[PDB]
Predict the structure.
Amino acid sequence: MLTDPIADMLTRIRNATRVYKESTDVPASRFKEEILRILAREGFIKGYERVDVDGKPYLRVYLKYGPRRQGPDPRPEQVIHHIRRISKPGRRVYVGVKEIPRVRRGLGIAILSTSKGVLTDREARKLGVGGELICEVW
Amino acid sequence: DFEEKMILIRRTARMQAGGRRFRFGALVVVGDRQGRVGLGFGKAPEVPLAVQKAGYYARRNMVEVPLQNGTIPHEIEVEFGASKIVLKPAAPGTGVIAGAVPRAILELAGVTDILTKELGSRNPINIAYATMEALRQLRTKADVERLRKG
Amino acid sequence: VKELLEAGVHFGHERKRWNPKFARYIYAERNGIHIIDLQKTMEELERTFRFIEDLAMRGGTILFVGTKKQAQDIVRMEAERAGMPYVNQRWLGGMLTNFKTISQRVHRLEELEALFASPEIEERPKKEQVRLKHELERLQKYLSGFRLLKRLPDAIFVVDPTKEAIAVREARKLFIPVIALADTDSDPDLVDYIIPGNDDAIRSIQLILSRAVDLIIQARGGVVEPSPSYALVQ
Amino acid sequence: GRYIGPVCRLCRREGVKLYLKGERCYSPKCAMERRPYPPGQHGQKRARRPSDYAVRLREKQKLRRIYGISERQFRNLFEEASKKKGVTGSVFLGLLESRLDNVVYRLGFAVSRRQARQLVRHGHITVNGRRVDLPSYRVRPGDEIAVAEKSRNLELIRQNLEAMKGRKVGPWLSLDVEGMKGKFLRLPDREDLALPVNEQLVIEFYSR
RNA sequence: CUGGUCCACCCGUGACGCUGAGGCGCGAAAGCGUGGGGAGCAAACCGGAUUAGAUACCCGGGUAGUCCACGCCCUAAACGAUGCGCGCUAGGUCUCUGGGUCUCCUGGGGGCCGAAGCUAACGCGUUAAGCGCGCCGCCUGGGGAGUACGGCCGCAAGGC
RNA sequence: AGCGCCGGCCAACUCCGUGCCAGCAGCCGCGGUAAUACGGAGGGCGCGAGCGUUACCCGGAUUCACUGGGCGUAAAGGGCGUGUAGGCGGCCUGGGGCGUCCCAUGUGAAAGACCACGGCUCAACCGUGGGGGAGCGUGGGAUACGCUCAGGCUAGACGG
Ligand SMILES: [K+]
Ligand SMILES: [K+]
Ligand SMILES: [K+]
Ligand SMILES: [K+]
Ligand SMILES: [Mg+2]
Ligand SMILES: [Mg+2]
Ligand SMILES: [Mg+2]
Ligand SMILES: [Mg+2]
Ligand SMILES: [Mg+2]
Ligand SMILES: [Mg+2]
Ligand SMILES: [Mg+2]
Ligand SMILES: [Mg+2]
Ligand SMILES: [Mg+2]
Ligand SMILES: [Mg+2]
Ligand SMILES: [Mg+2]
Ligand SMILES: [Mg+2]
Ligand SMILES: [Mg+2]
Ligand SMILES: [Mg+2]
Ligand SMILES: [Mg+2]
Ligand SMILES: [Mg+2]
Ligand SMILES: [Mg+2]
Ligand SMILES: [Mg+2]
Ligand SMILES: [Mg+2]
Ligand SMILES: [Mg+2]
Ligand SMILES: [Mg+2]
Ligand SMILES: [Mg+2]
Ligand SMILES: [Mg+2]
Ligand SMILES: [Mg+2]
Ligand SMILES: [Mg+2]
Ligand SMILES: [Mg+2]
Ligand SMILES: [Mg+2]
Ligand SMILES: [Mg+2]
Ligand SMILES: [Mg+2]
Ligand SMILES: [Mg+2]
Ligand SMILES: [Mg+2]
Ligand SMILES: [Mg+2]
Ligand SMILES: [Mg+2]
Ligand SMILES: [Mg+2]
Ligand SMILES: [Mg+2]
Ligand SMILES: [Mg+2]
Ligand SMILES: [Mg+2]
Ligand SMILES: [Mg+2]
Ligand SMILES: [Mg+2]
Ligand SMILES: [Mg+2]
Ligand SMILES: [Mg+2]
Ligand SMILES: [Mg+2]
Ligand SMILES: [Mg+2]
Ligand SMILES: [Mg+2]
Ligand SMILES: [Mg+2]
Ligand SMILES: [Mg+2]
Ligand SMILES: [Mg+2]
Ligand SMILES: [Mg+2]
Ligand SMILES: [Mg+2]
Ligand SMILES: [Mg+2]
Ligand SMILES: [Mg+2]
Ligand SMILES: [Mg+2]
Ligand SMILES: [Mg+2]
Ligand SMILES: [Mg+2]
Ligand SMILES: [Mg+2]
Ligand SMILES: [Mg+2]
Ligand SMILES: [Mg+2]
Ligand SMILES: [Mg+2]
Ligand SMILES: [Mg+2]
Ligand SMILES: [Mg+2]
Ligand SMILES: [Mg+2]
Ligand SMILES: [Zn+2]
C-alpha cells in the first residue's frame, strides 16, 4: 500500500521529468490537487487535468522543460530541478510563520499546509501563518 | 586579461622493467575576476609542460559565474565522486571563507564574499570539479523567470 | 526543390530492434519492420532544408559523411556537385576534433603530388619510388574529399548517424550542427536537423542527398541539370 | 615594550619600505634604497614560491609592523573590528588610524610613529585640552590634538611643526600649525589611505 | 494425506493493510543419547611406499560415522556475502509456466545485454546496487577476542 | 629581555661536531661520515614580561550523522519463517479540535551576554538605559495536514 501518497506524487513527477515525459499520471486526491494548483501557478508544470484511467480518477500532470541545448547532450534544462519531501509519516515537520524556510533565496519555493489552506512560503508569510512543511521545490 | 593559479602539481609513477617511470599532473585555474573561470588538468613528462598543458586545457573549459556583487545568487551543494562542496551566499565584508582549492576557483571567478565547506572526500581534483560544477549550476532570478515563464 | 508522396522509396525501414527514442517518427508496425510516418519526414525536410539554404547562401561549408557501402558513392558524387568536402572511405578518428593534425596529412598529400611531377620523380632509389607512391596511394584513398576543408565545417551531413556515430560525436562536441538522414535505429536527439527515413537503400540515399545538393547549388546560385548519379541506382 | 630594535631590516623582510625612521627612510638611506632584499646571511638567494600561508602572514606583518603595534594589541583590534558593523577590513584600518600615537604622527608633531609614541608617553601631547600619555588612546572624531602648552617651546617641537608650515595633510585631519593643534575630523576611509597592504589577506590570516 | 502458488471471470467482504523488539516454530554437515541396521565409503587407527624427515599428500586394511526410529544439539562461505512491503522509471534477447483473437497480445517465474540514473571502482540496471515512503536488524580503525567475566540454554561438545 | 621554534604539515638555512652512537620525535619519521631533522655556532622566523611544557574541555571530527553517515566486495542484513507489543496507514464527507498554526496576556530575579551612551587620562574594570526570543500558564481564534468519533467508497488486502 502507498505509505506517503504525496511523496509518491512528488516522485512520479521527479521520475517522469528525468526521462522527459509528455504528461504523467498520479492517482487523484483533493490534497494532491491542491499541491498541483501551486506547482501550476508557480510555473513548474505546464498544468494538470483530472482524468479517469481505468475507471479510477487520476491527475494528468503536464510536465514542462527548457529548450534543447548545444554541444554533446542536447537534453534541455529541467524546470523542476529539485522537488523533495520534507514532512513525512513518522516524522512530521511543522513550522511557525517565524520559522518558514527561504528556498534558494526565493528562487525556489516551499509548500506548507496551513489551517488557511495549502500555500507557498510567501503566501504563508503573507497571511502570517505556519503549518506542516510539505516539501520544497526549485 | 586572464589570471592563472596553480591548484596542485603531483608526480605520479608507473612501472616498467628497470624501474618506475614518472609523469606530472597539474591543476590550473584561469579567471578574469569578472565572472569567468576555467579548470584545466594537464599531465606531462615534465612539470612545466604539465602546467602549460593544464593552463591550455583550462581556457578551453570556462564557466560564466552569475556574480551578484561579489557573491553567489543562491546556495548549492554538489557532489562530484565522493567529494561534496557547499557554497553559501555571503554579505560584503565576509570575504572568501574556503579551502585552498575552492578559494582559487572562486577568487578568479571574481567572487569576493562567500561561505564554503568541503565535505566527504577532500580529494583536490575532485573537490575542484565539484566546485566548477556548482558554479556551473548557479541560476538567476532572470533565469528562473525565463524558465518558469513559458 | 521539393517532393511529397515519396512512398516510392523511403518510409518503413529496419527490423524490429529499433531505438525507443525514434518512436516519435514511427507510423506503424508492418511485417516485422517499422514504417516511418512520412508527414513528419516532410516536416523535418522543410525545417532542415531551410537550414541548408541558410548555410548555402552564406558560403558555409557542409561536410558529407557516408561510409555505409549502400551509399559510399552517392555521397562522393553529390558532394562533388558542390565545393562540399566528403568522407566515404573511413571516418578517421579526430578529423574534426583533431582537425589541425589530421590536416597535416592533407598537406603531405598535395605536397607528394608535387614531387611526383617534378625532376625529383625518377630521382633517388626507387625504394622511395615505392614507399612514396604508396604513401600517396593511401592518402588519396581517404583524404580525397576531405582536402576541400580549410577549416572546420559549418554543418555535417551524415547518412546513418548510428553508423557514423564517431563523426556526429565530434560535431556535437565542437557545436558543429548535425544534419542527418537517420532512421528507426538512430537516436533522434543527437541530430539537430533530422530527415527520418531509410538510411539504407540507394533509391533513398540518392533521392534525398540529390534534392539536397540541388537546393545547395540553387540556393548558393548556379542552376544545374539533374543529378549525374542516378545511374548508380543500379 | 613595542619591538625596540633594528627597523630598516623589517622593511627589508617585507620587500617594501616601511617608514619606521621617518626622514632617513626618505633620504637615500632607508636601506630599501640600494639593498631591498631581505635580512640575514641568505638575503640575496632566490625566494622559493611562498605558501598561501606565508603570503597571508608577511602581509599582516607589514600592516602591523607599520603602526608598530604588538600582536596582542593588534589582534584585539581586529577582533573588535570583526564584531563592529560594516566591512571589517576598512573598519579595522579606521581603528588603527585612531590610535593617538598615530594621529600625532599623521599630524606631523613627530616624524615617525616610534617618536610620535614617546611624545605621548611624556605628556607632550594634549587631547581636548587635558594631557594624555596613552599612545593607544583612541582619538574620536571632533577631538583637538594639541601640543603640551608647556612643550610648544621644546626644541624638537619647533623643527617638526616648522617643516609642517605649508604642507597639506590628511583629508580627514586638519592642522592649525599655529596653536600647534590638530583636529581629527573623520575616521579615514580605505580611499583616504594609501597603505601598501591588502587588508583582505590580513582578514584571511585570522580566518584560518 | 497435505502446504504454497499462478491464470481466467471481475462474482462476494469493504482499508479487514505493511512491518515486526520480545515469543514460538523451522533450520545443511558434523556431533550427542537409547535402540536398530551396516552393502559401499571412511575421521581415528594398523600397515606399505615417498621423503632430508615425512605424525601428509599415493597404496592396502579399517572403527566411530554415514542409513532408520525417537529425543537433543542450533552452527556455516545458513551467500545474491544484497532484510520485508509498495509505487515510480527505455528497450533488446533467451527460457519455464498460464490465459488469449495464438506473426504476436497479456500475466507469473528463471537468465543474459543494456535507457535514464547510481557506484571508489568492479559493477548494478522493472529479478536495482535507480527514484521514493513505511517498519525491523546491524556498523562506528586493527590487534587483544568471538576471548575473559556474568546470565541464559545444552547430557556433552558447546551455543547465544 | 627573555623563551620557543627553522625536514613536511608550519613562518624561518648555513658551517662544524657526531657516525644506528650520542640523541630527536605531535603524526609522517631523522642518526650506520660529507644530517637544512641529533649537539654547538652564525644567521633567521614567531611572540615578548613573557615564552614553552604537561593535563583537561569544545573544535576541526557530517569520526554516533536531528541539522548531517552508512551496511554486494571496505565495518555492517538477523540462517528462514510465524507473528505479540509498538511504529506506519487508500479515496470521499461530516462532528470534535489532541498534535499543528495565529493573536493577546502573565510569567521569564538580579548579574552575565548583545546594543547605545557614560566614569576612572585609555583599557581591563564599572554604571545607566535599551532589546530579549524560547519554555511554560491563561484567554480567544483557524481546521489544510496528523489524531479521534460517524457515515460512505472500491483502486490495497482478503474471499468465491
Ligand atoms: K552525483
Ligand atoms: K560465560
Ligand atoms: K551473517
Ligand atoms: K472536520
Ligand atoms: Mg519523494
Ligand atoms: Mg528532487
Ligand atoms: Mg528537517
Ligand atoms: Mg613534485
Ligand atoms: Mg549563467
Ligand atoms: Mg556518496
Ligand atoms: Mg574521510
Ligand atoms: Mg563516423
Ligand atoms: Mg540503418
Ligand atoms: Mg565587521
Ligand atoms: Mg465485484
Ligand atoms: Mg456495498
Ligand atoms: Mg510478519
Ligand atoms: Mg499490528
Ligand atoms: Mg540441524
Ligand atoms: Mg546427520
Ligand atoms: Mg547415533
Ligand atoms: Mg576402504
Ligand atoms: Mg623432501
Ligand atoms: Mg618412513
Ligand atoms: Mg586409505
Ligand atoms: Mg539454515
Ligand atoms: Mg551461494
Ligand atoms: Mg527484517
Ligand atoms: Mg527479460
Ligand atoms: Mg530479465
Ligand atoms: Mg577503480
Ligand atoms: Mg546490466
Ligand atoms: Mg524497487
Ligand atoms: Mg549498494
Ligand atoms: Mg552484532
Ligand atoms: Mg584500540
Ligand atoms: Mg580494539
Ligand atoms: Mg572478535
Ligand atoms: Mg563459536
Ligand atoms: Mg550444566
Ligand atoms: Mg566452537
Ligand atoms: Mg617553510
Ligand atoms: Mg629540538
Ligand atoms: Mg656532517
Ligand atoms: Mg641544521
Ligand atoms: Mg625540525
Ligand atoms: Mg641541526
Ligand atoms: Mg603585558
Ligand atoms: Mg576533539
Ligand atoms: Mg560531531
Ligand atoms: Mg571516533
Ligand atoms: Mg541522519
Ligand atoms: Mg561512514
Ligand atoms: Mg574480506
Ligand atoms: Mg563487509
Ligand atoms: Mg565483510
Ligand atoms: Mg540474508
Ligand atoms: Mg535458514
Ligand atoms: Mg489516512
Ligand atoms: Mg512569552
Ligand atoms: Mg526577559
Ligand atoms: Mg535576567
Ligand atoms: Mg571613556
Ligand atoms: Mg543592564
Ligand atoms: Mg470508515
Ligand atoms: Zn626604513
